[PDB]
Design a protein around this ligand. Structure first.
Ligand code: CA
Ligand code: CA
Lengths: 160, 165, 165, 159, 158, 160
C-alpha cells in the first residue's frame, strides 16, 4: 500500500509535522510530570496541579490533531522515542511557570518555523491549519502564562 | 529523606510502580500509532482505528491512576524515556489484534509481578489497588481481544457469518 | 395416602409429570452447556450463546410451571439425578442447532405422550394445561430452529446473502 | 491450551468446575425445598418464596463461575447433578437447618478454592471470590442464623 | 460457640474488639479537637468542622467493625474509653500533626489486623479491611499531609 | 486568663456540665452495646436493636448540644475516661428495657440537679437551655419506655 491522495504535500512538511508531533508528545509528558509534582503531599498545590494537568491534555489534543491532518494530506505517521522531562522536581510555582512558559515559546517557535516551511513549499492548506488551530491558541496561552508570572512575582512584597 | 505520610511502602514497590508507569506510557504510545495507522487512506478501517484509540486512552487512565496512588503513598514519581512502538506499520487487522493481545499479556504479567512483590513486602493496600482497578480490567480485555481474533480468523472461509442474533 | 385437594389426578399422570420434570431439567442443563460453549474465546459467538442461554431459562420456566401444577393437583414432586449433557463440546453452529432441534423433538414427543396419557385417564385439566402452555410453544420453537438450520446451511456457498429486506 | 490463558492453573480450573457442580446441586436442593413448602399440606408461601429466591441465587452463582472460567481460558466440564438429600423436609426449623448446613459446605468450598488460588499465586481468582462470593455467604449464613433463632423462639410464650 | 461461626479465629475476634476500642478512642479525640476549635478564644469554624467530621467517620468505622463482628459470629467486649491525650490542642499545625499521628497509629493497627488475617487465613476479614479501611486511611493521611504542608506554608512568603 | 465572653456563668455550672457530658457519653456507650447485643445471631431482634441504636444517637446529640452550649457561655470542655457499660450481655428484652429505663431516670436526675444548681447560681440561661432541650425530652422518653415495659410483660399470658 501507498498513499493515493497525496497532493501538494511535500515530504519536507510531512517530516517536520512528524517532528512537531514528537515535540508535543514531549511537552505533554513534561506537563504530566509538573502536574503530579504539585500533587505531592510535600507540595500540595492542587490548583497548580490541575492547571498543568489541563495543559497536558491540551498538548495531547495538539499532537492528535496533527496526526489526523497528516493522514488527511496523505502523509505517514512516524514515531520516535519520547524524551523524559528536563527535571524530576520543579521547585516553587514561579519556577515551574517559567519552565512552562519556555516550553510553550519553544513549541510556538516550532509552529512558526513549520508555517514558514509551508510558505516556501506554497502549501496554503498547511498554513491555514496552523493559523486556525495553533497559532492563536499559543499566543493566548503564552499571554496567560505571562499574566500568572507577573501575579506570582507580585505575591511576595507589599502588593500581596 | 523519607516523607511525612509514608507508611508500609517499600522502596522496592515504589520503584516497581515507577516501572509499571513507564510500561503503560509505552503501551499507550503503541495504541496511538496503531490507531492512526488504521486511519490511513490505504487502510481506512475506522472501527478498528476507534478501538485502538480507546485503548490508548484506557492506558492513559491506568498510568494516571498509578501515579495518583504513587503520591497517595508518599512515594515519588520518576520518569524515563518512552520507547517508540515496535512497528511503524501494523499489517492487517489480525496482525494488529495479535500485537495488542501480546502487549496486554505483557502488562497483565507485569501486574501479577507487582502484586507478587506486594505480597512479599506485605503491602495489602497495593494488592487491593491492583485487584480492584487492574487485574479484572486486563482479564476482561484479553478475553475481548481473544474473542476478536477468533472472529477475525473466521472471516477467511465458510463461517463468514459472525454475531448472529 | 393421599392429599386433601386431590381430585381426578391419577398416579400415572402424577408419576409422568415428575418424569417430565426430570426431562426438562435435563434439557435446561444441556442448554446451559451449549450457552457457555459458544462463549469460549476460541468459539466466540455471543448471539448463539445468548440464544441457548435464553432457551435454558425457557426450560427452567417449564419445569417450574410443571411443579407448580403438581402441587395444585395434590401430587408430590420426586426429584432424580440430572444427567449431564450428552457432549462437552458441540462443534459448529449447525451441529449445535441440530442437537438443539433433536432435543426439542424429544421433549415435544414426551409432551404428546403425557397428553395421550391424560386423555386415557380422562383428565381434562392435564390436557388443557399442556395445550395452553407447552404444546404450541414447542412447535413454534421447532419451526424457529428449522428456519435457523436452513439459513445456516445456506451460509455455505453462493446464497450467502440472508435476511434481505 | 487457550490463547487467552495466563496464570490460570489446571488445578484451579478443575476446582472451579467442581465448585460449579456444587452450586448446581445447591440450586437443585433449594428448588426441592421451594416446592416442598408450596404443598397444600405444608402451605407456607413465605418459606417457599425464600427458598426459590435462593435457588435463583445459586443459579446466578454457577453462572458467574462459568463466565469466569471462560474469561480465563478454562473450559467448563459438567457432571451429573445428584438429587437433593430429602424428598420431604419436615418443619421450617429442620429445613432452615439443612439450608444453613448447605451454605456452610458451600462457604467452605469457597474458602478452599481461595486457599488453592493463593497457593498458586492467582490474585485474579482470589479477588473474584472475595468480590462476589465470600461476603455474600457470610451475610446469608448470618441471615439464616437469625431465622433459626427466631423460629426456635416461636416455641413457648416468647412469640 | 456461635451457630454461624466459620473460619473466625478467637485471636481475630479479640483483635477486632481491641480495634473497636481504638476507634472509639480516636473518635473521642476528634470530638475533643472539634470543640476545642469552636472555643471563642480559638474560633476556626473550618478546622472545628473538619475534626467534627473525622469524629463521625471513626464512629462509622467502629460501628462497621461491630456490625462485622456479629456477622462472623464473634462477640463484642467493650473496655473503658481512654480520654484524649490533651485538653488543649494548641495551634492548627499542632492539632493536625496530632490527627496525623492518630491516623498512622490507626492505620498500623489495621495493617497488623490484616497481617493476622493472612496468617489465620481469613480471606473474608482481609477483604473487609481492604474494602472499607486500608484505602480510606491512606486517603485521609494524604489529605492531612497536604494540609500540614499548606499550614506550614501560610507562614512566610508563600 | 478568663473567656472574653463569659458572663454570669459559674465555674460550678461549668464543671457540672462537663460531668453531664461524660454522663451522656457513658449513656451513649451503654446504648451502643445494648444495640449490638440484640444484633447477635443468637438474640436476633432487629426492631429492638434499632431502638437502642437510635437512643445511642439521641444521647450523642445530647452531649453534643451541651458541649456546644459550654463554648457559647465561655466555659471550657474537659473530658475524662468513659466507663464501659455495666454488662456485656443484656439478657431478654424486658431486662434490657428496665436497665435502659434506669439509665434514663439516672440522667433525668442529673438533669434536675443541674437545673437546681442553675437556680442556685441564678443562671436563667442554663435553666432555659435545660427546660427547652432536655427536660421534656426525658419525660417523654421515660413514658415511652414505661409503655414498652407494660406491653412486654403483658406478652406472656391471656393478653399476648
Ligand atoms: Ca486564514
Ligand atoms: Ca480485594
Amino acid at each position: 500500500m501507498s498513499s493515493q491522495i497525496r497532493q501538494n504535500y511535500s515530504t519536507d512538511v510531512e517530516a517536520a509535522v512528524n517532528s512537531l508531533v514528537n515535540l508535543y508528545l514531549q511537552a505533554s509528558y513534561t506537563y504530566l510530570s509538573l502536574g503530579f509534582y504539585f500533587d505531592r503531599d510535600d507540595v500540595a498545590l492542587e490548583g497548580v496541579s490541575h492547571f498543568f494537568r489541563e495543559l497536558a491534555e491540551e498538548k495531547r489534543e495538539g499532537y492528535e490533531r496533527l496526526l489526523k491532518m497528516q493522514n488527511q494530506r496523505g502523509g505517514r505517521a512516524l514515531f520516535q522515542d519520547i524524551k523524559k522531562p528536563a527535571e524530576d522536581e520543579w521547585g516553587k510555582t514561579p519556577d515551574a511557570m517559567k519552565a512552562a512558559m519556555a516550553l510553550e515559546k519553544k513549541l510556538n517557535q516550532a509552529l512558526l518555523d513549520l508555517h514558514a516551511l509551508g510558505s516556501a513549499r506554497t502549501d496554503p492548506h498547511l498554513c491555514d491549519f496552523l493559523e486556525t488551530h495553533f497559532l492563536d491558541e499559543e499566543v493566548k496561552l503564552i499571554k496567560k502564562m505571562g499574566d500568572h508570572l507577573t501575579n506570582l512575582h507580585r505575591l511576595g512584597g507589599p502588593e500581596a
